Design a protein around this ligand. Sequence first.
Ligand code: ADP
Ligand code: 250
Ligand code: ASO
Length: 477
Amino acid sequence: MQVLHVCSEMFPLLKTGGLADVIGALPAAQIADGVDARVLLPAFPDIRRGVTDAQVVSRRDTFAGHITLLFGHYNGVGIYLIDAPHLYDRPGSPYHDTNLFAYTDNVLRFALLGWVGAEMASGLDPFWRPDVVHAHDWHAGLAPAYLAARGRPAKSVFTVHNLAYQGMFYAHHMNDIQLPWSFFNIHGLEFNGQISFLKAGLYYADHITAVSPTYAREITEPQFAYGMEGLLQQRHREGRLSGVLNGVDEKIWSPETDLLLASRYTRDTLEDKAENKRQLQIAMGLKVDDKVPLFAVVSRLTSQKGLDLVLEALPGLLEQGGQLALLGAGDPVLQEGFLAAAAEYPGQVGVQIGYHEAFSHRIMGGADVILVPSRFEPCGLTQLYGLKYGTLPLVRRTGGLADTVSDCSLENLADGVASGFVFEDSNAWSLLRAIRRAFVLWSRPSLWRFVQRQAMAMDFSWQVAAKSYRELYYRLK
Ligand SMILES: Nc1ncnc2c1ncn2[C@@H]1O[C@H](COP(=O)(O)OP(=O)(O)O)[C@@H](O)[C@H]1O
Ligand SMILES: O=S(=O)(O)C[C@H](O)CN1CCN(CCO)CC1
Ligand SMILES: OC[C@H]1OC[C@H](O)[C@@H](O)[C@@H]1O
């Protein structure tokens, strides 16, 4: 079984979100479970410089110009690079320049990634050819379309990490990307008058996966599918739609082992987490106080995440004795909003705007509650990290969050399954009730500790996940 993941990020080389963490870990898991997984990424500079044993495999002209295909290893997995510097040799984001605008040639940049992914099914590498091309999100969405145009020399799976990003390009571009003009159709890649790379993935793949069981269902609803629910419902009935929950990488997210933390700790020695708390309080500039719950946020700041509700509920949170530590980047309305909040309530709100990998560890390791109050959430790795760090997650019952967190309800406490806090509707009031709940639990320290241990007993394993994908790759044959 040979699989090629086609995608545009991979931790630790280049990461803008959860996709990178999946790509950084799933292939190794799959290899453990007896699938020969390789990864194909565009040669962005950070990726290129991480893969130091990369040799030339071949060299092609292409509708977007010349690529030289490289192959190397990284962390014991086979990595293919699309080396096309006129497209990819640009600093910073895969997706947009330094003043946050999509590169005007994105349509070529990502069509090519899709294209190379499909060429591998046909022998671009004379020595290795995948049986399944596994494509991730809109960036790799044309790969199944290129594969359909060639008569499907390999079976394809497209997995949606997030339905909200649709990869829309002007229809004329049908002219620049080398696909049959016939593919521009509602039964194909056309979507609301433009080209959709997402639609191309959803339509042309042999099978579609979402990154959690409940999100696989939610995307058959209009509330989450944004116009695609028609395709998704059909594809559901055909048995071509499923969810496979993400794992977490234990090499990099485990308090037992985590070298970025002031102090390491375990499910049985939670006393050792205290010190991470003091240090976080200091670093953020909060009153150093162990008698008080410290809530935390680590996320992209965009409407998806519900953070404006956190903002809205903060007075109520502070009024009960709580602290807030925030680390995140995006919506300047939110950035500014949160910065304002920290100014107004110094010593009880700390806020670092920006992206800092290592500091998210120091937060995960130090806080009592991580807040993930998403409007929608295909998986959400941060609450999985909070579970593992025994920092209890406070989430909205949607997507992966619904799949992975159990509320402190009396049944749940009694069955020994409660692992955090869940609220139901997208508004400050509904969130504030979960906040109150956490204040109540906090005043029953035994119970808090009991829930902490259950949180830290949940297991999110990539090798378990691999097995599900393996089953899929065999069903498609
Ligand atoms: N400001 C930040 N600094 C460091 N890491 C961040 C920041 N924002 C998000 N992350 C990380 O990115 C990942 C977020 O992935 P996830 O929870 O799946 O949501 P999404 O894929 O929608 O970003 C987590 O590993 C989280 O720690
Ligand atoms: O914003 S763009 O449409 O131009 C590009 C990407 O969708 C940015 N991402 C990568 C995938 N994401 C969701 C899963 O990690 C975060 C947004
Ligand atoms: O696929 C992993 C991550 O990627 C995309 C989603 O936005 C997020 O919920 C998920 O955790």
